[PDB]
Design a protein around this ligand. Structure first.
Ligand SMILES: [K+]
Lengths: 206, 205, 206, 201
């Protein structure tokens, strides 16, 4: 379950060629146009993809995501912008990434997730916004980066997975960026909420 | 709920226009002149507002605060300056902020807070200083920023909340900086300490 | 609580004037020549002092300490340098400091400390080395500094406390650097180990 | 348990002389050519050595490792590259290293390690890759570095330990870089998995 070639050479260079990158952009960090919700290892997850269009070192790279909404407190205070962080692994250190080929960032929709109670229908009807961020510092250029994007509820594709971008050649790996934004539908995905899923699971565990 | 327009565009540009920022001199990181103490979601909180009025984003930003006072140890040792950390979310990572429009930083006055035993009258009589800090990197460079301010006990407004600065236009959001330092009164705010409120919550149950 | 003058002005200027700073140095971060062991609120602590003579603030400053020794594993492996981290607050974030006036860094000698079993007599006959480090970015240039020093066991003053350096004037605070390295002696300090202290406290209550 | 001389002088200078660094292909050489698996204090450990960069001395330094492989989820999804972080002390802060002389980084193969079930023969039949990373800031600058290397399963030497590189002289310590990549064999090393070593205690 590893390809023929090494992914990282002994000298630290990655053994990867990027193809179909398009026009050499000034910002080389990029997020997928859509986010997805799908099952992974028995858990309902929100995911989004991030990549570096070139072979630079993003040092001390890490990701965050926040749900953006207004809120009224119990005291009647109006909060125009409540920025609610969504768990992508801060507390265990797995928000920190080693970015070579595009990575799918994963938020598990568990009881602590803002999305725990949302079914496909709920999302279809909703108006919320998730901002996603990738920060680190590019080694060669000494530039601290904060790549930002946003998914509105209508840009999250319930029941989709990303197309593979990373392929093995005999001597190296290629990343096909023509597949970066591409997704496919998984009809087998539950349409109900993570909460419903956990209830249906307990009922069968007995 | 959400305004009509997106806050952050797909290309990462923040959909926000700043108004009433004033002269050149004022295009920096800034803290509100006052801090406030008020209830939020059934908890008494110390809050203060921070903003960025420059053209450049502050990357990997995070906040701290410390109460400054002298202290005598039980051994009789005089400590001229004790810098007692005030919890604004370090342990869960919520001290890390994504700073676009001005943010109200929140210290919950819980059992571990230096302010747990203090009522409005205690703050009135007190002379401590709370130093506030905002740090981060200048986007697209290797440079750093540290913004420092402080609030004397007499600059903390018990039973106040900040005026909103963030308003919805049809295609974008505006930040009105003329409201940044402004507050309103909440006469409803309890005048006792967070400890006392924690007790009045047993006398209920 | 507090002096007449604020310590930090609204504009972030610190209201401090430094006097008796040797003058014109290489290395403007400095550690006290000695470390001390003394009681602080019922607990035996190892302390050392750090100062900032820069023209600038030290941004994202934080401290560490390590005990340096060789050791042999149970398998017979010789480790020429085992670097044993000494707790100065990492786990709650209080290893992070806002360094204006000299700060006394405190290591509580508790059950998890390498020094838990060491009495004044033990230290008098010991040969270990404790390296102390202060890291951060110079505000003006983002230069990352790592200020390092070292205390051999014989450079630790059992039963000493630092002389105050920070004094109140009418409108400002003065930091007298002629007192930076100075200590005074506290004859009342127990001579036994932190573990002995914990046992006696236990015996007293039971 | 301490040499005659101090390792760090009062002024912060480290009392270490580096020798036999060579015209070495890279002055960028940071990681040992091989990783090892061996017992250390009754635990089976995966280890590898890292030195500081000769010409870019790194501070605020810290290490990471990941196991790289493909996997299929239970839903049938093919993941070309799963990057599973390997514990080297993040949670307690001991992933942060004060890197003067070459340090042997230690991943304890416990119940939570991806290697927990692998015996010497399992590693022989394996094709996985372990990426190792060192990051820090170049001392006295605002510049940053990420140094990488990699160990294929067949580059991990079961039952080996590194040769010492750090040596006491009278007034200082020398780091003999001629021994950096060298190992010795410990025939005494158990050949079973860390799971099996645990399930006999
Ligand atoms: K933690």
């Amino acid at each position: 379950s590893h390809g023929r070639s090494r992914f990282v050479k002994k000298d630290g260079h990655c053994n990867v060629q990027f193809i179909n990158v398009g026009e050499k952009r000034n910002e080389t960090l990029v997020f997928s146009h859509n986010a997805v919700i799908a099952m992974r290892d028995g858990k309902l997850c929100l995911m989004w993809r991030v990549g570096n269009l070139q072979k630079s070192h993003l040092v001390e790279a890490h990701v965050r995501a926040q749900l953006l909404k207004s809120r009224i407190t119990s005291e009647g205070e109006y909060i125009p912008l409540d920025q609610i962080d969504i768990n992508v692994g801060f507390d265990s250190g797995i928000d920190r990434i080693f970015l070579v080929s595009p990575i799918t960032i994963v938020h598990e929709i568990d009881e602590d997730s803002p999305l725990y109670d949302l079914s496909k229908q709920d999302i279809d009807n909703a108006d919320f916004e998730i901002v996603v961020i990738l920060e680190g510092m590019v080694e060669a250029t000494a530039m601290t980066k904060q790549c930002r994007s946003s998914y509105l509820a209508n840009e999250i594709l319930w029941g989709h997975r990303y197309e593979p971008v990373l392929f093995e050649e005999k001597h190296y790996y290629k990343v096909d960026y023509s597949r970066f934004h591409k997704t496919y539908e998984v009809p087998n995905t539950p349409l109900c909420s993570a909460r419903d899923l956990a209830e249906k699971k307990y009922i069968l565990s007995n």
